[PDB]
């Protein structure tokens, strides 16, 4: 049903976007149920959802039998082209600690 | 936004100030047979019908609203059908 259960106070979009404190084992199924036709975020930073296809990301993941967040990073942000970057954070996105 | 990258292929992004560069990334394989339901999932059923929810297989076929259904299911039919168990009507004499 739910992308990861046990990621409480998290929606599937939340889990999909990688919102802090929503992370967990997304187990595998040969059958999935699509409960949210227009899925939603339950917090973090304000998104303008409707200006991209982003809303369907969970329903897309759902289509597959096996899903998994990755490990590491597909790119180093700080060394990216355009000059060295500090990495931004915002309240409304608290982590295991808080902050 | 998200962008899907086929099996093996790389991808590209162009940007100016304010970019969120991707870090962790989804990795998916296999395929699950998706239906349109509404939690919670209660108990077991033989069949899952998009209109009727849980279903248990009783007779081989069913009449009614047809939609996508997964599992051991009865088959949809236009009209309720009867197999004859008996004789032709005979007026007494």
């Amino acid at each position, epitope marked *: 049903g739910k992308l990861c259960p046990k990621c*409480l*106070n998290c*929606t599937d979009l939340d889990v999909a976007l990688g919102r802090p404190k929503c992370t967990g084992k997304i187990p595998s199924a040969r059958v999935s*149920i699509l*409960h*949210e036709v227009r899925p*939603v975020t339950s917090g973090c930073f304000p998104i303008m959802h409707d200006r991209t296809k982003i809303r369907q990301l969970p329903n897309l993941l759902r289509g597959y039998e096996h899903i998994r967040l990755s490990t590491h990073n597909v790119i180093n942000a700080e060394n990216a082209p355009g000059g060295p970057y500090k990495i931004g954070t915002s309240g409304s996105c608290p982590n295991i600690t808080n902050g | 936004d998200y962008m899907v990258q086929k099996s093996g292929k790389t991808g590209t992004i162009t940007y100016q100030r304010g970019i969120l560069l991707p870090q962790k990334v989804w990795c998916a394989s296999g395929r699950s047979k998706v239906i349109k339901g*509404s*939690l*919670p999932l209660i108990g077991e059923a033989d069949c899952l019908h998009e209109k009727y929810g849980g279903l248990n297989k009783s007779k081989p076929y069913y009449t009614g609203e047809h939609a996508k259904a997964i599992g051991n299911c009865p088959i949809w039919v236009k009209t309720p059908l009867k197999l004859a168990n008996g004789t032709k009507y005979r007026p007494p004499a």
Partner: antibody
Amino acid sequence: QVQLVQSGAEVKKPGASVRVSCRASGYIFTESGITWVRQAPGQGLEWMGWISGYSGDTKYAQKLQGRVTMTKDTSTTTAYMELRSLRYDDTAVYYCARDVQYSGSYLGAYYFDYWSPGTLVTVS
Amino acid sequence: QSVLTQPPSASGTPGQRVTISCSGSSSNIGTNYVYWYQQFPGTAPKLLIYRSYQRPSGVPDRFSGSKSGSSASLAISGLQSEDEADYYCATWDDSLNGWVFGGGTKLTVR
């Protein structure tokens, strides 16, 4: 123990609005919903609408679309019902009830369970 | 004017079996599950029968649910003084896109 606790009794002039509160306890709020039902004094039950504790999705009774709004707050596990443009017909007891359904189209395939004590709203 | 039709009154001497009918149509009782609620004066209604035939825990087998076509029925057997209340049937109605309630029957057993 499954609990629902509502805001206090309200009294309002015709034309104003009421926000009734419904705080939830003893179950996983984010995997259930709230319906609201109201009861005119000495009368029957009128379904008002439902809202998901998982997604905030709502479905309202046809007669009350426009006038009603439901919202919910996962943090405080609380649901709210707002009724605008009060007339004398809106005098009733407002119940909230735990509804088993929390996602998919709301189509009455599920049901609602426990009812809160009731909040009276008197419309001068 | 209620969508589901319930007699206003039902009665029986203590010990007897009384029935309460509930009369609807194809869009509601015909295609949907029936639910029954019991209300004592100045209290919340309580779920008495669910999915047409089931009993919640606490509800004695004295209470029984029935359904046939577009009509459902509540049977109360072994009638007792504490069953004096109001009984409401409810089902979803696909035509009105919302739940519907019967007018409520008052059960009088002295």
